[PDB]
Write a protein that binds this ligand. Structure first.
Ligand SMILES: *C(=C)C1=C(C)[C@@H](Cc2[nH]c(/C=C3N=C(/C=C4\NC(=O)[C@H](C)[C@H]4CC)C(C)=C\3CCC(=O)O)c(CCC(=O)O)c2C)NC1=O
Ligand SMILES: *CCC1=C(C)C(=O)N[C@H]1Cc1[nH]c(/C=C2\N=C(C[C@H]3NC(=O)C(CC)=C3C)C(C)=C2CCC(=O)O)c(CCC(=O)O)c1C
Ligand SMILES: *[C@@H](C)[C@H]1/C(=C/C2=NC(=C\c3[nH]c(C[C@H]4NC(=O)C(C=C)=C4C)c(C)c3CCC(=O)O)/C(CCC(=O)O)=C2C)NC(=O)[C@@H]1C
Ligand SMILES: *[C@@H](C)[C@H]1/C(=C/C2=NC(=C\c3[nH]c(C[C@H]4NC(=O)C(C=C)=C4C)c(C)c3CCC(=O)O)/C(CCC(=O)O)=C2C)NC(=O)[C@@H]1C
Ligand SMILES: *[C@@H](C)[C@H]1/C(=C/C2=NC(=C\c3[nH]c(C[C@H]4NC(=O)C(C=C)=C4C)c(C)c3CCC(=O)O)/C(CCC(=O)O)=C2C)NC(=O)[C@@H]1C
Ligand SMILES: *[C@H](C)C1=C(C)C(=O)N[C@H]1Cc1[nH]c(/C=C2\N=C(C[C@H]3NC(=O)C(CC)=C3C)C(C)=C2CCC(=O)O)c(CCC(=O)O)c1C
Ligand SMILES: *[C@H](C)[C@H]1/C(=C/C2=NC(=C\c3[nH]c(C[C@H]4NC(=O)C(C=C)=C4C)c(C)c3CCC(=O)O)/C(CCC(=O)O)=C2C)NC(=O)[C@@H]1C
Ligand SMILES: *[C@H](C)[C@H]1/C(=C/C2=NC(=C\c3[nH]c(C[C@H]4NC(=O)C(C=C)=C4C)c(C)c3CCC(=O)O)/C(CCC(=O)O)=C2C)NC(=O)[C@@H]1C
Ligand SMILES: *[C@H](C)[C@H]1/C(=C/C2=NC(=C\c3[nH]c(C[C@H]4NC(=O)C(C=C)=C4C)c(C)c3CCC(=O)O)/C(CCC(=O)O)=C2C)NC(=O)[C@@H]1C
Ligand SMILES: *[C@H](C)[C@H]1/C(=C/C2=NC(=C\c3[nH]c(C[C@H]4NC(=O)C(C=C)=C4C)c(C)c3CCC(=O)O)/C(CCC(=O)O)=C2C)NC(=O)[C@@H]1C
Ligand SMILES: *[C@H](C)[C@H]1/C(=C/C2=NC(=C\c3[nH]c(C[C@H]4NC(=O)C(C=C)=C4C)c(C)c3CCC(=O)O)/C(CCC(=O)O)=C2C)NC(=O)[C@@H]1C
Ligand SMILES: *[C@H](C)[C@H]1/C(=C\C2=NC(=C/c3[nH]c(C[C@H]4NC(=O)C(C=C)=C4C)c(C)c3CCC(=O)O)/C(CCC(=O)O)=C2C)NC(=O)[C@@H]1C
Ligand SMILES: *[C@H](C)[C@H]1/C(=C\C2=NC(=C/c3[nH]c(C[C@H]4NC(=O)C(C=C)=C4C)c(C)c3CCC(=O)O)/C(CCC(=O)O)=C2C)NC(=O)[C@@H]1C
Ligand SMILES: *[C@H](C)[C@H]1/C(=C\C2=NC(=C/c3[nH]c(C[C@H]4NC(=O)C(C=C)=C4C)c(C)c3CCC(=O)O)/C(CCC(=O)O)=C2C)NC(=O)[C@@H]1C
Lengths: 177, 275, 40, 164, 177, 164, 164, 177
């Protein structure tokens, strides 16, 4: 894969050149947030048992065709599948935020699942809808703007990592169209 | 031990000496910032401008009317069509192109102010624009609290076409100029708060404008006592018109210090422009 | 959590290394589950 | 605006200071004479069409020169705007019996009145004297209460004073 | 700047209306509660040096992340500048509780108040926590439900003023979030 | 000074303006509650030797550490000056019941109190708490009238507020 | 900040002027006595847990009144914050032996100390006297070198001087 | 404003660390070259008129684009602003080479510099050309390898300060670009 440091290698390899003084204001820029980049990667893997449980339950309680009899989450096999089947996507962005780039997010999971969810049944309505409930809750934890649990951190701005992180989340979120 | 279907929620028991058990509870702890949604083509993170940031259209609006506020107030200085002698901006030798580089340094050093003093001067000038206008409007402060250059060109502009500034009101005796000197020392102490000299009384960049700034004021110090006999007599009544009413309210001692010593109460400069 | 972990199930596309292999087991090792992913 | 709220909550902000009991005292004088101040307001609300017409040609009796062409009252279209002009003064004086001070007068209808009228060749001497007709036009134990006319009459001679 | 005797006129000047006795009973209720508002606002400024000291101690009680070095609010000039900003908002809401109208709240601080703070690097989640303490002690002083401090009053309902201060700090709190 | 005279005749001079009816209204609230304000003044004039002694060792009960050498209360010569010090605070609060605002407090006994005391190694925490002893030390329908204690008690917690 | 770099490179900018040999001379006095200044820094780095505990109850011996409820030392949670408070003074004085002047003291831990403490009802008289315990607590040929204590002791009585 | 004796505090103060002899050998090597720093920086202010002589002249040696009328920098008042601007960077890098730290540059000239040059119409490629001539003559002047001008010296190693001045001017060149 490529991290945020290996992004500036390969296009500067493509220019047949050196890592010069042009990208020094980007490879000092990721040096500075690495206190709060590592503070933000802890905030998703801490709550991720509550996060994927909230993501399926909010999807089901507003779309009751998933608890249709003979449906996609009707049996206990098909309900325990989707608790894992949307959790690995939550796991794969937890490595992608830490690397500072979503280069891992294409060659590990996004190469295939657009034509694989329909290949055994899983439709396009609720799998796009399962990402967006995780998306507005992932921005709440890193900004300490949840409703029920307030994490004790330092003081500072977090919109810069929110426009980062959303990218990973949503990129897999779409994908499926 | 054993339950019943009866209703005794109400009721108590009285044997509540109850200072023997103390209890509490909690809940809280949840801030919230409004964040945007949809990855395709977008993601925004908060940024530090350290300025007004109230619109690009508002920012280019803001310097135009305060230029017009200054040109309003250049037209009260030249009400009668004189470039009046209180405004001096040079020396004997020409050097106002050298004092251009003094004032464009002040145009530059006020631009490269740090984030504390860029933001402190936005709010102290807003309440000083309330002090600058006498009347209380629906209009004037409703420019002067959104816009700050307009507030800054009003506390400079309206106050320079009265004669309560520095170096313009002449003291009578040795006693008035000495406490005129001593209140300037605390205005040094304001702009030099500690062992570091500030960036903002720098008054020069090159060797030519180093000693040009010294001989500029000594010609302007003479042009206080040169120009008139009644406008400088109107200065000593004007010096109470900035200090008594919006600088030392409540202190009678600091009120009769103005009416006994107007020229000492005229370089008190409480418009904190870091000079 | 579902089990002890949540790892990648081997019935996904691109579940192999596929680096300096034979001709008969390159295109068997690449394109693992295209038997229904395209045919529909 | 202009009231006792514009004095003491602004001066405590101009001192950077609490609302101390100097500020809490100043509004008590509103309370004991708002009943004195606010039966005067419904008089000129009850006479908002009655005394506009009696003040215009009382002014135009002593200013009868206006009806020639080339002046401020050359047609009835001016006089249709002229009863609008005294009533727009008369709207604000009604509101200053409510806010206490001369709040709606100075920031809306007083400041820069001496940059408008004779530039539009409107005579300012007829403007104060139409108001000075209505200044003495009162009768304190008969029209309103005796505690109501001294807020009314002190605002009308102020209108001649503020044009000075 | 503007108050409840001037909020009633400024809409009527957009329609050029003579004020009558169709809206003065709102102001007759306002001039009814003259001393009742005055028996509220004296109790605010009686103990508001304790209110500033209670708020930014309890805001530090929930969060020691400021007092940590490298934090926003940890040293002695910084706390004096914190005790500066902690007073100035309590100074302003007492003016609007005197006015019966929060116009004087808006123009004098809230114009761009929110993101001068991130122009200074000041945490805005700590700001809404501290003024929530200043919300909570303020209603206990315009009632008589403090811990020890029972001022002298005459009895009766004061919840209409308690809803008026309830509409005040959140207007600041929405203007800083 | 500090009163409603220091508000409105100074703001009309700060506007360069007449004493209009905003300024004439603000002193009416003096008149209706000077009778409320000025039976409180002869209480602490009647108790000008009574409550100075009861506040000193109520303070020196909760500040009993002072009697060692090298501190603020090392001898009776300090305590002979200490009952002078609370009474000099107590003189000014009596005068602020007369002028309306806190006139004699700020320009004489409040401003620059935080440049004096611990420089003279005098504890400021005992200064507010001697006053906060006397702040709650009242009984509004029994000592004075009910209209008299709310000017008294609002000035005493102000003395802790002005030292903040 | 506050050092000789804050004097001469700022005054040459305040004159709009070159770094002339007045500015080049002023830093030579750093060089000949940095060895005098910087064996004092590792003493209170070596005793950064040793002399914080010996100064707290030396202060709380002569200020033993704090343990009542309603004061600055009502529980151990205050005393757990109180050894943080003397150490946060003690951090900065260590840094002023490195920068030369009192650089980290004034802009971080000195300015506006007289707007905080008794407002939080913290006694300032105990703050200087905890420091004045450590001011004379030295022994110049035995703990450190004789060239090291005169930078140390001149900063500690400055802490009483800067609170004045 | 800030020096190398106070660069070494704001890391340790941020982690509340008392500075001990684990990092005082960096200042012991910095108080080693105390007179050696003065022996370098006496040689730049000695011919400080000669370095603003050679720079803008070598700038107009390589570029006859500016000297064309209708260009940016052809005329003498504009060249007076130029030869104001050329020495002021030279005036300020002497302070940082005195201090052993680049923070005295970093707020007093680099704050808001390049966008004023595109607010005025200054071409920035000529600026990084002219500071490179200033960088090229200063390393000869702190050493003993000029053409004619040789000062008396105590000989030895002077290249650690030569790496310091070469890391100082290009940081100014990174600001204007
Ligand atoms: C830290 C662990 C911590 C604190 C410090 C303390 C602060 C605190 N206080 C409240 C609630 C109130 N505080 C009030 C203030 C005072 N009460 C008084 O009697 C005096 C005059 C003054 C203290 C100087 C008041 C009136 C209240 C309301 C309830 C009450 O009567 O106690 C909170 C909670 C704020 C909220 O409710 O959101 C905090 C944090 N408490 C601590 O836990
Ligand atoms: C208080 C009087 C006043 C008015 C009105 C005004 O506009 N400015 C002041 C004083 C004043 N100064 C001058 C003349 C000149 N000033 C300069 C320097 C300008 N160049 C600059 O970069 C700046 C900073 C923005 C300034 C001011 C120059 C070059 C002159 C030329 C006169 C000369 O000796 O040839 C004047 C006179 C002309 C004018 O209308 O500005 C006044 C009145
Ligand atoms: C508020 C409306 C008060 C009031 C104030 C008065 N202002 C007077 C003059 C004045 N007003 C301004 C602000 C405004 N005028 C401008 O030209 C511009 C911008 C280009 C603005 C925002 C200025 C700058 C000045 C001085 C110069 C001038 O006259 O234009 C004024 C006349 C006397 C005086 O100069 O003070 C008054 C009375 N008027 C009111 O009644 C309400 C209460
Ligand atoms: C009067 C008792 C006030 C009050 C006064 C304070 N002023 C403080 C500093 C200060 N005051 C002035 C204005 C005044 N002081 C003078 O010496 C002269 C002229 C001779 C005047 C008109 C100035 C200019 C300054 C700054 C420096 C100085 O002292 O000269 C002050 C100290 C705290 C502060 O910096 O503000 C006080 C206490 N403060 C009050 O509370 C009453 C109302
Ligand atoms: C490389 C940049 C230079 C160079 C530097 C060296 N200087 C050496 C010694 C030295 N320089 C001075 C003068 C200095 N001290 C002052 O007080 C003032 C101004 C007021 C100045 C300019 C002195 C006094 C010394 C001797 C003290 C010492 O540093 O030990 C030096 C050798 C050190 C030694 O001899 O032990 C070097 C390498 N010398 C060069 O040749 C290039 C050009
Ligand atoms: C900032 C507010 C200042 C304080 C404090 C101060 O005393 N001067 C301000 C800036 C400043 N200037 C110098 C050195 C010079 N300043 C000059 C201009 C001044 N000289 C004058 O005659 C006048 C009018 C009275 C002024 C403002 C000149 C010329 C010099 C000397 C240049 C030279 O010949 O070397 C200083 C440093 C003072 C020192 O000697 O250290 C400061 C802080
Ligand atoms: C008739 C009895 C009067 C007279 C009146 C005229 N006024 C004219 C214009 C005008 N009047 C005012 C002042 C007044 N109008 C307002 O809207 C307000 C405030 C709400 C006030 C106090 C203004 C500001 C203007 C100009 C704008 C406008 O037309 O409203 C007018 C028309 C003049 C013309 O168009 O040539 C007349 C006739 N004129 C008199 O001489 C007698 C005394
Ligand atoms: C609710 C917020 C309060 C509360 C309010 C009440 N106040 C009542 C009567 C009252 N208060 C004052 C004093 C007030 N007027 C002043 O001029 C000044 C200071 C300058 C102050 C503090 C007076 C004079 C009165 C009596 C006049 C009146 O309002 O009728 C009151 C009883 C009303 C009544 O008896 O009709 C109430 C409910 N009281 C409370 O218990 C909470 C804490
Ligand atoms: C005893 C119950 C106190 C205490 C009192 C002391 N105050 C001392 C000096 C002092 N006090 C003030 C404030 C007060 N005195 C006034 O004259 C006025 C205004 C009219 C006020 C508010 C001042 C200004 C001074 C210094 C000048 C003077 O002596 O009057 C003092 C003597 C200290 C000494 O000489 O060392 C004492 C003992 N001290 C305490 O700790 C308790 C609480
Ligand atoms: C114990 C030996 C002391 C004492 C200490 C207390 N200080 C309290 C709060 C406090 N202290 C300071 C000054 C100090 N703390 C710092 O963080 C820095 C600079 C880095 C310094 C110089 C400040 C600024 C504060 C307020 C913010 C904070 O809590 O850090 C304190 C708690 C008071 C309370 O919460 O009520 C205590 C107990 N107090 C004493 O009386 C003895 C002498
Ligand atoms: C000429 C060979 C240079 C060049 C110079 C220019 N600088 C111009 C304006 C300017 N530059 C600054 C930044 C710098 N100069 C200072 O005086 C200060 C300190 C206050 C600093 C940091 C400022 C502040 C200004 C405006 C005032 C001034 O002129 O000093 C400029 C524009 C003049 C024109 O209109 O022609 C030029 C040409 N630009 C170049 O391309 C080469 C490298
Ligand atoms: C007091 C002036 C004298 C006495 C009797 C008079 N009463 C008059 C009454 C009158 N007034 C008006 C205009 C009136 N309405 C208003 O709203 C206002 C101002 C706010 C005013 C002044 C009108 C239309 C009348 C007639 C109908 C009525 O009586 O209400 C008056 C004026 C002449 C007239 O029209 O009648 C006089 C004179 N009695 C005395 O003792 C006083 C000398
Ligand atoms: C109200 C506090 C409670 C009740 C009875 C009490 N009366 C007390 C009276 C008392 N007060 C003082 C000091 C007094 N004199 C002053 O000038 C001032 C302030 C301006 C004050 C507070 C003195 C010397 C006495 C005793 C002689 C007397 O009765 O006048 C009091 C305090 C304890 C005492 O000394 O008696 C209480 C308690 N009754 C109630 O219902 C209230 C709870
Ligand atoms: C000089 C004061 C007298 C003599 C002997 C004493 N030595 C003492 C030593 C001592 N000092 C401390 C605290 C110390 N550590 C620090 O880091 C700092 C400040 C930066 C200080 C002051 C400690 C813990 C000791 C004991 C262990 C040791 O000896 O190092 C001392 C104080 C009492 C004591 O605890 O021993 C005295 C007295 N000899 C003389 O001639 C001087 C009169």
């Amino acid at each position: 894969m490529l991290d945020a440091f290996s992004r500036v290698v390969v296009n500067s390899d493509a220019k047949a050149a050196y890592v010069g003084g042009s990208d020094l204001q980007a490879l000092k820029s990721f040096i500075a947030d690495g206190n709060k980049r590592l503070d933000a990667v802890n905030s998703i893997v801490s709550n991720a048992s509550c996060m994927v449980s909230d993501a399926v339950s909010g999807m089901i309680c507003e779309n009751p065709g998933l608890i249709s009899p003979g449906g996609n989450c009707y049996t206990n096999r098909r309900m325990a599948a989707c608790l894992r089947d949307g959790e690995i996507i939550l796991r794969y962005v937890s490595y992608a935020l830490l690397a500072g780039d979503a280069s891992v997010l294409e060659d590990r999971c996004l190469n295939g699942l657009k034509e694989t969810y329909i290949a055994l049944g899983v439709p396009t309505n609720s799998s796009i809808r399962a990402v967006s409930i995780m998306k507005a809750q992932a921005v709440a934890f890193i900004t300490n703007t949840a409703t029920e649990r307030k994490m004790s951190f330092a003081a500072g701005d977090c919109t810069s990592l929110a426009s980062e992180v959303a990218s990973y989340f949503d990129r897999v979120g779409a994908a499926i169209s | 031990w054993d339950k019943l279907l009866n209703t005794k929620p109400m009721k108590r028991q009285v044997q509540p000496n109850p200072p023997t058990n103390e209890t509490r509870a909690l809940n809280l702890g949840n801030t919230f910032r409004s964040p945007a949604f949809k990855f395709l083509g977008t993601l925004k993170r908060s940024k530090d401008p350290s300025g007004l940031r109230l619109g690009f259209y508002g920012r280019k609006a803001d310097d135009f009317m305060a230029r017009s506020i200054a040109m309003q107030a250049k037209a009260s200085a030249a009400g009668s069509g004189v470039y009046t002698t209180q405004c001096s901006e040079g020396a004997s030798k020409g050097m106002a192109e050298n004092a251009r580089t003094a004032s464009l340094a002040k145009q530059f050093r006020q631009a490269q102010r740090s984030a504390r003093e860029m933001s402190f001067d936005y709010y102290e000038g807003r309440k000083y624009a309330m002090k600058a206008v006498g009347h209380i409007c629906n209009y004037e402060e409703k420019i002067f609290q959104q816009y700050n250059k307009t507030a800054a060109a009003y506390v400079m502009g309206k106050q320079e076409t009265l004669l309560s500034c520095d170096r313009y009101a002449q003291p009578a005796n040795k006693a008035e100029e000495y406490i005129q000197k001593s209140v300037q020392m605390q205005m040094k102490k304001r702009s030099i708060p500690y062992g570091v000299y500030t960036t903002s009384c720098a008054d020069g960049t090159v060797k030519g404008m180093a000693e040009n700034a010294r001989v500029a004021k000594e010609s302007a110090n003479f042009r206080a006592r040169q120009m008139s006999a009644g406008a400088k007599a109107a200065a000593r009544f004007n010096a109470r018109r900035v200090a008594n009413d919006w600088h030392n309210n409540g202190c009678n001692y600091e009120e009769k210090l103005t009416s006994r010593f107007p020229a000492a109460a005229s370089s008190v400069r409480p418009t904190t422009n870091r000079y | 959590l579902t089990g002890y972990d949540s790892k990648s199930s081997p019935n996904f596309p691109n579940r192999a290394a596929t680096r300096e292999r034979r001709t008969v087991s390159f295109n068997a090792r690449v394109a693992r589950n295209k038997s229904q992913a395209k045919k529909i | 605006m202009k009231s006792v709220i514009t004095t003491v909550v602004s001066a405590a902000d101009a001192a950077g200071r609490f609302p101390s009991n100097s500020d809490l005292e100043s509004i008590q004088g509103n309370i004991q004479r708002s009943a004195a101040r606010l039966e005067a307001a419904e008089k000129l609300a009850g006479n908002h069409e009655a005394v506009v017409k009696e003040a215009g040609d009382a002014c135009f009796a002593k200013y009868a020169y206006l009806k020639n062409p080339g002046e401020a009252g050359e047609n009835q279209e001016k006089i249709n705007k002229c009863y609008r002009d005294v009533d727009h003064y008369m709207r604000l004086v009604n509101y200053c019996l409510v806010v206490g001070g001369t709040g709606p007068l100075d920031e809306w209808g007083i400041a820069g009145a001496r940059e408008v009228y004779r530039t539009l060749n409107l005579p300012t001497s007829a403007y104060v004297a139409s108001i000075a007709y209505t200044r003495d036009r009162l009768c304190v134990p008969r029209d309103m209460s005796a505690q109501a006319g001294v807020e009314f009459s002190a605002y009308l001679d102020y209108l001649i004073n503020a044009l000075s």
